[PDB]
Amino acid sequence: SQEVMKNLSLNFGKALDECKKEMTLTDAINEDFYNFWKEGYEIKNRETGCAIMCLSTKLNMLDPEGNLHHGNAMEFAKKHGADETMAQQLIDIVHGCEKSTPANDDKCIWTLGVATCFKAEIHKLNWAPSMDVAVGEILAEV
Structure with missing residues (x-):
């Protein structure tokens, strides 16, 4: 897919x-989401995962x-007509990362x-080459 994945944003x-309202976050996570x-x-930023998990909560992406x-999660991918295999990989990548990622005091x-x-997986999968503008906007790049 690649495009569908940007586009579904x-x-x-x-x-x-x-989430930045609700958790009084700062505005540099806007860079953090904008192409890793x-x-x-x-x-080093940490409030990013807070915003991520807030979105995943609102989007019912996670179990409780x-x-x-x-x-x-698959229903979000089906919205534009993703690839079946890409949609399933982006799920299995969770099942792999969680298998390595131990635990923490802060969700x-x-x-x-x-x-x-x-x-990272998307990168080594060769599904993020040089396209840029993946999640974000263009508002005087400086």
Whole structure:
């Protein structure tokens, strides 16, 4: 897919600003979501996983424990007509990252390992080459 995955961001970072209201977050997570890039750098920012998990909560992407929900996540991918295999990989990547990612005292940090491992898998999968503008907007790049 690749495009469908960017494109499906109808509300995906629209609602960042609601979570940024609700949790009084700062506005640099707007960079953190905007194409992870790098090769293997877990960004130092931590409030990002809080915003991520807030979105995943509102989007019913997770079970009420915090494991991801395969079919509920799949329904988000089906919206534009993703690839069946890409949609299933982006689920299995969770099942892989969580298998490595131990535990943490803070569910934002718990998420962030998995959250970064997701963008890592997409990178080594050769599904994020040089396209840029994946989640975000262009509002005087400076």
